[PDB]
Amino acid sequence: SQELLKDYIKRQIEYYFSVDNLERDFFLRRKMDADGFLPITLIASFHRVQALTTDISLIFAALKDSKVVEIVDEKVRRREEPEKWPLPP
Template sequence: MFFRIFSRFRTSSRERASLGLSGFVLPAASSDRGTDMLSPSLHSNAHASNNACMYSSSSDDQLIAQLEYYFSQDNLVQDHYLRSQMDSENYVKIMTLCDFAQVKKFIEDVTDPEQHIATLVQTKSAVLQVDDYGLKIRAKSGPEKFRLVVRDVPIGFDEQKVLNLFKIKNESKVIRAELATTSESFATWYVGFAHAEDSQKAMEHLRKTEPSFKV
């Protein structure tokens, strides 16, 4: 049942690319720039599946579920376009989201999409919040809003060594590093940041300094 509900949101990045769409693809990002619900990669579907239980099949409830997926940590890890649209407080303009194909289809007949989405988020979502002016939304989650997944880290690396990887000019914006999985020779770590800009800079830094690590 969960799959049937959320498969309606699915649009792969390859499909979007074949349509000649520009940009990374956010969860149905502007003109399909962004990733989508149930996109491949790191998303465990747990968040989306739980929402499926909570919401009915109405258009408004499906729209909220889609928006909540966009701002989930698992999507933000891979969604460079959406992160690029965030301001210093991690808000994204509602009108930007209105351009995403997976949002557009739910608001085609709405007179004022911006106000409609702001009201829905305020009344229906437990994980999103609207700014004081009703123009932007963001996740309500705690200080760790962005997480990088670092693969192929040598087994000998402990938490401090992982944290040191992300020091830029002797300063680190990492909130925490958590060991995720291990194999015979390598490990995967989750590294959390408070802001999109910090995670982006950290990712670029690691790719330059430790190209053998996958992030």
């Protein structure tokens, strides 16, 4: 079920970058740079992501077409208004 696996990875990570979650997720926001980017390694270590894959290359594949998040090099951010969310590390 690799297509379903990719969809579950996408939905879980798009949840972390939803406004509903970001409002309260200080740990995640303290890991952003000033552009909102944080390492995909951090996301890949979260328990719900580990429950789907331990292979970070499948995460990149699952997110390739996301309209919520944007991947640059090995980091990911929320696309919309990215500077609203970072917090002092």
